[PDB]
Design a protein around this nucleic acid. Structure first.
Ligand SMILES: [Mg+2]
Ligand SMILES: [Mg+2]
Ligand SMILES: [Mg+2]
Ligand SMILES: [Zn+2]
Ligand SMILES: [Zn+2]
Lengths: 744, 171, 108, 346, 180, 112, 79, 71, 83
RNA sequence: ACAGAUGUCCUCGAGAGGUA
């Protein structure tokens, strides 16, 4: 269990809810196929969004049993995992499948380092295994070369643009077509596929899709949404969507912290009994719910401030909270030295905001736009307060105490660390200290603005990068009250450009012959950007893999020249994958809009591949723009199964309709306003919980063990609309008078 | 095949409804509870007849709390999947596993080793169906199914059917 | 806690002996290894005297047989397959008396 | 109920045709309700354009949109009675309340067979301010946050009202009404009927006892009758107090208000049936002896209807009356377009 | 939920008998001569598929007139049958009762007999034999052509060997079902 | 509102669901709204029937139900005529006290 | 009062008893609403009773002593 | 969070004027302050009682919230 | 079995019966349950129970079990309360 | 892609000295 999960469970305990996973009955050896049209015990669900990376990644190269066969085993595992998730959630309106693709230049800074660290770990473990076999062979035993050559799955090879992504995308389409054809309950379900060709990080695609579904006047505000992902920030990102009917599904990491991890050798000691018990135990994986509707009430009861010149708005209150949480920690910028734990600093930042809010005469952020003087005052107050936090952290570290090593020599607890911290990154020169401080201030402000725009109003630069490795220390951004931030739109990177900007190590061989020849040659124009020994590992507090790299950045112009030089001699078949592509929408044979789609597109009109159809959410759902498919799909045809050894029956094209889906362009800026006609959920909170969250509780102090206990006693929480009227009865009369009479 | 029985259900009425209309309260409770219940011992309680006839007895007040338990005596139509008989049903789903034949409020499943070897799965036609010589079953078709399943009555009942031997087809 | 089973009061208690078939059937695990916490002194050995299928031993780990902790787990029962039949200490006198009553060569 | 057409009547009284000049969209989160907004504001800053109106019951836009509908279509419709949502409401409601509460002045003309009938301050200003603060003109999702924040410190004006023609009738008798729609609650469909999506909002005082409950019941009866005469499915009421502060806003959908008055005192429960029967009897009396022109260019006469002593005294006036000259010949309620259309087909 | 008192050592009978097979061998609770609520010794009913539809329809209309008068005091072929059944079920039972629609549809689209006189004739014909009501219910529910087909589809019918009267009443059932 | 510190007050507020609220730890001086059907664990007040017993309990008069009267000293006080059935003196004797936890038990102790 | 002092005031336990066994060897899954007795294949004849924990310990020790204290919720006088 | 925690305080006014004790548990407005000479606990308002140094020194009122420190 | 109305127990209410009815009624009034008398300014459930029992307005039935197993039902209103 | 800690009560069999 992560520290963030523990923090959110301690501060907000009721957000943890139990799940109801159906177990199909087994009679006479056979397995009863579970129904899909039956009512879901976990409440009605309409929209489900799934990050396909979060399923294809754990299935491949797992920590218990690596797939012994070829990619086929991983494909079967991800197919059964997706089937289990679909049966658990049971979407009724639209099911969304998205996998990571092209990402903006800011993401390469940390993704490249993570991939290189993983590759180095794989290389060193392979060397250790080779040494183990060499020592074992000295005794006299003989091991087949197949076992020795049976290396890992090369997790670094899973990158957008590789043929593995294309093979996975081809398999996914067949799987969803088979599911739509063979399941009568999928008649109204609509499935979209966002392959690795489509740019996005997996979650930003979901944000764009939900803002495009909210880009229609007739969109129902009462629709429920579910997003499944293992990322910790996923539960936090869904709050920014301003959708009360939201809940996050994820695996129960509380049990998985100390789950079954015994060695395979012990599985044969007791023969049938122990193996049967083990296979029964791991067959069921508990999950949990991360409802956001309840969390909105907790945030409302925790962000209240008495006395304010402006008007307290719940929608605007969450904006400052999400901006501050992103500032404290995100996967786009280096961690602030002051905010390292990222858990205990949240309350300090919140009370700083509470004490500075009366001084300010305006809100923190306005629809993603950061108020420059207000944020300047906030960071000035934090820097004034950061001294006490730094002193307490140093005292705690000293009490606890009682690969380059850089932070140890800094000795931040001693007075005068302002230049001592910067000496670990640059030379000992006075004016250079000020120059680097100003540059870091400008870069950090630009990065904060860029991440706010990306997570609120979508991508705005697509090429911005962070040209630094160490975040500025406390009392930063002293004078910056004159800069104006205005980002420029840039074209997304090509799949090959993004793949080489990820910069896999020499172990990776997903590149074609030309690119690997241009790399492996000792006299390479970009050989300086590709280390071999990788000695850039550096601790900087923390431990284990949490250390960051210090390798030099990559110049975009050199990589562009390299790709433009390698392009002309590449084969046309391989170059055919350079197309950005568009998401593909799949609908059932008996869909409400199926007749209209079959009469408009792929019909007797026989237009020259330029007719598009725009439809609203009044009929069926999934508002958007559909276009002619660019693949080989055609009416009265057949689709070849790519799984091969999967015993999957072939299907015809008359059962599944395939077309290219394009999101509706945003007319105006995506504001944060609750849509009219939204029906609030049932009132579940009590004033006691409001007081509990208003008073500062030191993790409940373990006075009565209220943190952990009858967790299952919280039961399920009702979801969906509750009551025709969207306004709670306050004073008034008639209906409110009758309610008061029946209550009192 | 449906049976008319004389079942009994115990309802623990709360003292908050100990008024002149507690009888009608028990009546509506019995309706809202017994209907749609998939009891393992009996099956489905489709409907309760003679609503204005069912009688209640003196409710015994429990020693623990003031709630009173009433032993009602109702009669209703009960459907049980049973075992060892032929029955007619209508398909509602089809897949490689089998066809989901529906008889009344039931969904009897047929596995691979149940039907004879004269059925092969294919998706060439508009409905995904098992097609072979002189056998035509589809999403909506007539089929006679013989039940030989173990039911497995655990808070709900099920059924497994067979297609072996003649007369178990469309006809 | 809520249980869908009807709540009743015990009206009769029937005593009797335990047949080997019944105790074998109701048993949830078989105990053969005469060791406890033998999983490299980290976990409980499978098939030992502290088999996890018996029930929740400590902390808050739910018993895998019933997916619950201790506040509602009666405690599941195992069994031991004795190599040879063994007399019951409390029934020695009755066994001797019934052996004297009946013939030792025929069941008459 | 079927929609025939619509028109807009903004400032300068140009009576534009088939334009959604305002199409006010309702939007009011509960946070704004809890914000305790003030409905008084700039009372002296009100700009009323009704004073400069040339006619309170002017139907020039209705006549123009009827001409446009007839030009687009072929044969004329079977509806006879035409009312600008004011005569029908008063005629039905006068049988339920005292005649002193309503002023009767009706001018009925049978041109071309069809029938054309033409007829506190602080509370009114507070209601108009609430109406303006409960809408944002252009639909949400297409306006910046600046308009949202400016809506609080906005101005109040009397004009630019969206009016749509609704065709209805019971039995053989059919009639159309020039109903004015000031709010749309859901997505608006272009080229399709929007009656099922429209909504109406008003203001009312709170309740304190049974007498105030009966007053609220009477107001609900009035608004339900006025909506059912057109077909508005949604009714919105904004509660107000002695301090002119919006306390709570609740919506009253149709198909449930009749049962809500039924489960109340018998008077309000039977008021619905009494009003329905009175409307039916009034329509039957209206279709009794009014002359039918049939073919165009026929004799045209005007009638005067006065409701006194619980009786609709109707008399046939002579040509010597000044009103006859100003209507039959003066064409005060008619227009050159209608006579041109009448001469066009015959 | 039970209707019969404990007898014949129910506590520890272990496996008294295997579950019901094709060759009759009824269950412990569904045995003949059930205990009547008011008295005792009530035989199991002989209810067929067509009889079930009429019985449920009669119960539905009885409850319909019941709560219709209560609220008043307080204040083609298959296509026509489906609409009437839907409008009756929409408000009579209330609640959810999803399974009621499926069984009603099955009764309507598989109604062998659609007249009270027809079902009266068929059960007055079937009461002549001493067969188990389970056998007569299946015989009157599923139409059959040959004697061997009836024996195979409906087992535990070996007591009839003559097959002459069996052919006679099979033809009677066939013509009654075609007289719908 | 008084709290568990003053003698007239409560220590816990049992909710309808079953969760227990501790008025000592939570405190906050909050205006908690008590919905109907909830349970409040208040301190024993005057005229509260309790069971008063002495060991050994030879006869039925060795344990009888009294009425609670709160006194400002830490010792059980009883009438002199009551000691005779209890067979107790004031030379160091200690005697137990039992508090009923339900209405029917209180009524049974009061009437029997 | 005696029952309250013996059970509510000291220890109250809820257990499930098989209707055929009479013992407490019933696996209960309240979340899944499953009550199966593996000994008799019983899934529709499960009852719950309230007994003190001391009684539970005594019954378990007796069962360990090869003695079956079968518990039933009906009278056998009706035969 | 609360300043009045583990700091020696002197009770002012009431029947315990001039007494010396250490506050152990603080909740809401009432503060539970133990007594040195007397073996009892008295709950009084935190504002009423003055605040002293653990080692010894001048006494101050509840203005420690502004100072956010001791002494 | 029930002994018709040829009952032969005592036409009066025993002390144990009085205590049991008083406790049951006190619990029922303590919970949200209807009261069939005029509280008249009483707020203790036990006293409300005694007030209800004063004029025999308690809708409770006593089932006196014979040692053999038979039982006869006695209404509260028909039971004489002399103690 | 991802991921470093907490849940409140422990004795148990005995022995000795005393109080009603
Ligand atoms: Mg991420
Ligand atoms: Mg209005
Ligand atoms: Mg003494
Ligand atoms: Zn267990
Ligand atoms: Zn059993």
């Amino acid at each position: 269990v992560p520290s963030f999960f523990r923090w959110l469970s301690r501060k907000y305990p009721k957000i943890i809810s139990p799940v109801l996973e159906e177990q199909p009955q087994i009679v006479d050896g056979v397995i009863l196929p579970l129904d899909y049209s039956a009512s879901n015990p976990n409440g009605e669900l309409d929209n489900l969004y799934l990050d396909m990376n979060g399923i294809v990644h754990p299935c491949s190269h797992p920590e218990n049993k690596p797939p012994p066969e070829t990619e086929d085993e991983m494909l079967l595992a991800v197919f059964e995992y997706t089937n289990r998730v679909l049966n658990m959630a049971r979407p009724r309106k639209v099911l969304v499948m998205a996998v990571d693709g092209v990402a903006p230049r800011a993401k390469m800074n940390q993704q490249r380092a993570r991939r290189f660290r993983s590759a180095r770990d794989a290389q060193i473990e392979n060397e250790a295994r080779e040494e183990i076999m060499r020592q074992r062979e000295e005794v006299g035993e003989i091991i087949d070369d197949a076992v020795r050559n049976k290396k890992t799955w090369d997790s670094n090879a899973i990158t957008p643009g590789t043929p593995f992504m294309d093979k996975l995308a081809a398999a996914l389409r067949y799987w969803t077509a088979f599911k739509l054809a063979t399941d009568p309950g999928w008649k109204n379900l609509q499935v979209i596929i966002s392959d690795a060709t489509v740019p996005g990080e997996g979650e930003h695609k979901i944000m764009n899709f939900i803002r495009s579904q909210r880009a229609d006047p007739e969109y129902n505000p009462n629709t429920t949404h579910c997003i499944y992902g293992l990322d910790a920030d996923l539960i936090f990102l869904g709050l920014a969507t301003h959708e009360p009917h939201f809940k996050i599904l994820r695996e129960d990491v509380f049990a998985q912290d100390n789950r079954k991890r015994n060695n395979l050798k012990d599985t044969i000691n007791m023969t049938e009994e122990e193996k049967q018990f083990l296979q029964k135990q791991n067959s069921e994986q508990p999950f949990l719910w991360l409802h956001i509707n309840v969390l909105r009430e907790y945030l409302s009861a925790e962000l209240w401030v008495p006395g304010l010149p402006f008007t307290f708005d719940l929608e605007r209150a969450i904006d400052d909270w999400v901006f501050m949480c992103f500032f404290c920690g995100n996967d786009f910028l280096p961690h602030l030295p002051c905010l390292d734990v990222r858990e205990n600093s949240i309350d300090i930042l919140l009370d700083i905001w509470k004490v500075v809010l009366p001084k300010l005469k305006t809100y923190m952020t306005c629809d993603g736009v950061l108020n420059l003087p207000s944020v300047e005052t906030l960071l000035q107050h934090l820097g004034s307060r950061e001294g006490d936090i730094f002193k307490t952290r140093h005292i705690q570290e000293a009490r606890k105490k009682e690969v380059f090593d850089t932070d140890e020599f800094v000795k931040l607890f001693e007075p005068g660390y302002h230049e001592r911290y910067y000496t670990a990154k640059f030379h000992v020169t006075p004016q250079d200290i000020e120059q680097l401080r100003k540059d870091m201030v400008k870069c950090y402000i630009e990065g904060v603005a860029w991440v706010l725009m990306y997570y609120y109003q979508g991508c705005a630069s697509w090429n911005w990068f962070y040209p630094y490795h160490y975040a500025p220390l406390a009392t930063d951004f002293h004078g910056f009250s004159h800069l104006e931030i205005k980002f420029e739109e840039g074209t997304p990177f090509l799949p090959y450009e993004q793949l080489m900007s990820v910069l896999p190590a020499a172990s990776g061989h997903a590149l074609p012959k030309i690119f690997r020849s241009l790399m492996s040659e000792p006299d390479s124009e970009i050989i300086d950007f590709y280390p071999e020994e990788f000695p850039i590992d550096m601790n900087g507090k923390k431990m284990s893999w949490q250390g960051i790299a210090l390798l030099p950045f990559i110049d975009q112009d050199r990589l562009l020249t390299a790709v433009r030089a390698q392009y002309p001699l590449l084969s046309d078949a391989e170059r055919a994958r350079n197309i950005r592509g568009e998401p593909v929408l799949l609908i059932s044979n008996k869909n409400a809009n199926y007749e209209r789609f079959s009469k408009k597109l792929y019909s007797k009109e026989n237009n020259n591949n330029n007719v598009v159809v725009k439809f609203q959410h009044f009929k069926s759902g999934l508002s958007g723009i559909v276009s002619k498919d660019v693949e080989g799909f055609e009416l009265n045809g057949k689709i070849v199964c790519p799984i091969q050894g999967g015993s999957l029956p072939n299907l015809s094209t008359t059962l599944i309709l395939k077309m290219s889906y394009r999101l509706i362009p945003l007319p105006s800026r995506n504001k944060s306003i609750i849509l009219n006609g939204f029906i609030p959920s049932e009132p579940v909170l009590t004033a006691y919980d409001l007081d509990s969250i208003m008073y500062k509780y030191n993790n409940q102090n373990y006075s009565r063990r209220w943190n952990f206990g009858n967790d299952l006693k919280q039961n399920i929480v009702p979801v969906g609309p509750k009551g025709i009227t969207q306004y709670k009865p306050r004073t008034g009369g008639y209906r409110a008078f009758f309610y008061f009479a029946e209550l009192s | 095949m449906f049976f008319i029985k004389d079942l009994s259900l115990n309802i623990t009425l709360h003292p908050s409804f100990f008024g002149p209309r507690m009888k009608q309260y028990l009546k509506t409770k019995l309706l809202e509870e017994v209907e749609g219940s998939c009891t393992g011992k009996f099956g489905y309680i489709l409907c309760v007849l003679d609503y204005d006839n069912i009688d209640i007895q003196r409710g015994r007040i429990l020693p623990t709390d003031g709630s009173a338990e009433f032993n009602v005596k109702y009669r209703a139509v009960v459907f049980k999947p049973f075992k060892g008989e032929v029955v007619d049903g209508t398909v509602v789903s089809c897949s490689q596993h089998g066809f989901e034949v529906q008889v009344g409020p039931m969904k009897v499943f047929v596995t691979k080793h149940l039907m004879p070897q004269d059925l092969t799965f294919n998706a060439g036609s508009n409905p995904p169906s098992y097609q072979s010589s002189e056998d035509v079953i589809t999403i909506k078709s007539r089929i006679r199914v013989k039940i030989e399943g173990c039911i497995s009555q655990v808070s709900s009942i099920h059924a497994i059917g067979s297609i072996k031997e003649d007369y178990l087809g469309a006809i | 806690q809520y249980s869908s089973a009807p709540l009743r009061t015990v009206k009769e208690v029937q005593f009797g002996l335990f047949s080997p078939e019944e105790v074998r059937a109701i048993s949830v695990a078989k105990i053969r290894f005469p060791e406890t916490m033998d999983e490299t002194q980290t976990r409980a050995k499978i098939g030992g005297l502290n088999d996890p299928r018996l029930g929740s031993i400590d902390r808050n780990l739910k018993c895998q047989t019933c997916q619950e902790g201790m506040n509602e787990c009666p405690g599941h029962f195992g069994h031991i397959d004795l190599a040879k039949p063994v007399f019951h200490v409390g029934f020695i006198a009755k066994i001797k008396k019934v052996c004297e009553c009946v013939c030792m060569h025929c069941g008459k | 109920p079927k929609e025939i057409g619509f028109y807009s009547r903004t400032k300068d009284e140009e009576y534009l045709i088939s334009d959604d000049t305002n199409l006010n969209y309702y939007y009011l989160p509960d946070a704004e309700l809890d914000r305790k907004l003030d409905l008084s504001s700039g009372f002296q800053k009100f700009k009323d354009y009704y004073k400069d109106f040339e006619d309170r019951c002017s139907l020039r836009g209705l006549l123009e949109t009827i001409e446009s509908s007839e030009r687009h279509k072929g044969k004329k419709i079977n509806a006879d009675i035409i009312t600008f949502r004011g005569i029908a409401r008063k005629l039905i409601s006068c049988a339920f309340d005292s005649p002193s509460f309503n002023t009767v002045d009706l001018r009925i003309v049978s041109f071309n067979g069809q029938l054309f009938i033409k007829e506190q301050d602080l509370n009114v200003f507070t209601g108009y301010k609430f109406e303006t603060l409960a809408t944002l003109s252009n639909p949400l999702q297409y306006t910046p946050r600046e308009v949202i924040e400016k809506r609080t410190k906005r101005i109040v004006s009397h004009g630019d009202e969206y009016i749509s023609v609704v065709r209805t009738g019971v039995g053989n008798c059919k009639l159309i009404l020039g109903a004015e729609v000031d709010c749309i609650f859901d997505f608006k469909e272009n080229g399709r009927d929007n009656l099922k999506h429209y909504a109406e909002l008003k203001c009312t005082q709170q309740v304190a006892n049974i007498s105030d409950t009966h007053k609220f019941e009477r107001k609900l009866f009035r608004t339900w009758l006025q909506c059912f005469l057109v077909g508005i499915p949604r009714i919105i009421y904004g509660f107000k107090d002695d301090h002119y502060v919006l306390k709570t806003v609740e919506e009253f959908s149709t198909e449930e208000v009749p049962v809500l008055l039924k489960n109340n005192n018998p008077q309000v429960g039977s008021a619905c049936l009494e009003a329905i029967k009175w409307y039916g009897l009034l329509t039957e009396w209206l279709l009794k002896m009014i002359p039918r022109d049939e073919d165009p260019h026929s004799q045209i006469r005007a009638f005067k209807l006065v409701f006194e002593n619980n009786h609709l005294r109707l008399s046939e006036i002579e040509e010597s009356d000044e009103e006859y000259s100003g209507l039959i010949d003066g064409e005060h309620i008619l227009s050159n377009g209608f006579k041109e259309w009448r001469k066009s087909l015959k | 939920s039970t209707s019969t008192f404990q007898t014949r050592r129910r506590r520890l009978k272990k496996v008294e008998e295997e579950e019901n097979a094709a060759t009759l061998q009824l269950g412990q609770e569904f045995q003949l001569k059930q205990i009547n609520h008011q008295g005792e010794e009530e035989e199991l009913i002989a209810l067929n598929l067509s009889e079930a539809r009429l019985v449920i329809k009669e119960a539905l209309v009885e409850r319909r007139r019941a709560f219709k008068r209560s609220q008043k005091k307080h204040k083609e072929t298959r296509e026509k049958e489906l609409e009437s059944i839907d409008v009756l079920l929409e408000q009579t039972t209330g609640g959810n009762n999803k399974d009621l629609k499926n069984t009603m549809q099955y009764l309507t689209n598989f109604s062998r007999f659609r007249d009270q006189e027809t079902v009266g004739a068929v059960i007055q014909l079937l009461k002549s034999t001493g067969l188990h009501p389970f056998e007569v219910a299946q015989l009157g529910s599923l139409a059959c052509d040959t004697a061997d087909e009836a024996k195979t589809l409906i087992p535990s019918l070996n007591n009839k060997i003559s097959d002459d009267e069996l052919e006679r009443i099979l033809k009677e059932l066939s013509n009654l079902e075609t007289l719908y | 509102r008084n709290g568990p510190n003053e003698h007239p007050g409560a220590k816990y507020v049992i909710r309808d669901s079953g969760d227990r609220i501790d008025l000592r730890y939570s405190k906050r001086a909050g205006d908690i709204q008590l919905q109907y059907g909830w349970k409040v664990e208040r301190h024993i007040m005057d005229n509260d029937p309790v069971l008063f017993n002495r060991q050994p309990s030879l006869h039925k008069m060795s344990m009888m139900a009294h009425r609670v009267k709160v006194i400002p000293y830490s010792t059980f006080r009883l009438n002199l005529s009551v000691t005779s059935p209890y067979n107790a003196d004031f030379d160091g004797d200690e005697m137990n006290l039992h508090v009923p936890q339900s209405e029917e038990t209180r009524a049974e102790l009061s009437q029997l | 009062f005696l029952k309250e002092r013996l059970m509510e005031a000291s220890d109250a336990f809820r257990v499930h008893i098989c209707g055929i066994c009479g013992l407490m060897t019933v696996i209960a899954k309240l979340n899944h609403n499953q009550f199966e007795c593996k000994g008799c294949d019983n899934k529709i004849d499960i009852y719950q009773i309230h007994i003190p924990y001391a009684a539970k310990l005594l019954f378990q020790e007796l069962m360990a002593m090869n003695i079956t204290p079968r518990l039933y919720t009906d009278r056998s006088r009706d035969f | 969070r609360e300043v009045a925690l583990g700091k020696t305080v002197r009770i002012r006014s009431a029947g315990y004027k001039g007494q010396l004790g250490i506050v152990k548990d603080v909740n809401g407005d009432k503060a539970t302050v133990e007594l040195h000479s007397k073996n009892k606990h008295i709950t009084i308002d935190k504002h009423k009682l003055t605040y002293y140094n653990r080692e010894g020194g001048e006494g101050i009122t509840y203005d420690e919230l502004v100072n956010r420190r001791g002494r | 079995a029930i002994p018709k109305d040829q009952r032969a127990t005592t036409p009066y209410m025993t002390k144990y019966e009085r205590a049991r009815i008083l406790g049951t009624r006190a619990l029922q009034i303590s919970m949200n349950a209807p009261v069939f008398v005029d509280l008249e300014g009483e707020t203790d459930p036990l006293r409300i129970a005694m007030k209800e029992l004063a004029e025999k307005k308690i809708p409770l039935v006593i089932r006196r079990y014979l040692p053999d197993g038979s039982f006869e039902d006695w209404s509260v209103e028909e039971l004489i309360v002399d103690l």
